[PDB]
């Protein structure tokens, strides 16, 4: 995401291809979400 | 992290020194972790 920027849509670009843009913030918050799930178990003890 | 970028390793560039890299994402997730700290003694009570 930091290497590119979002503009327009996919229709206005001639020759555009489909791929999966890697979000650098997605796994960091997902791994932190798994850390929260470990801390959520401490709410019962 | 926004003022630098990760490239290569520490064994290539000559004269490299050891230090810590402050990540702006760390305190935001730490403050939220400390915001959750008050919730442990809540549910258990």
Swiss-Prot record, chains A, B:
Glycans are attached at residues 18, 42. It comes from the Viruses. Subunit of the fusion protein that is processed upon entry into the host cell. Mediates fusion of the virion and cellular membranes by functioning as a class I viral fusion protein. Contains a viral fusion peptide that is unmasked after S2 cleavage. This cleavage can occur at the cell membrane by host TMPRSS2 or during endocytosis by host CSTL. In either case, this triggers an extensive and irreversible conformational change that leads to fusion of the viral envelope with the cellular cytoplasmic membrane, releasing viral genomic RNA into the host cell cytoplasm. This is Spike protein S2'.
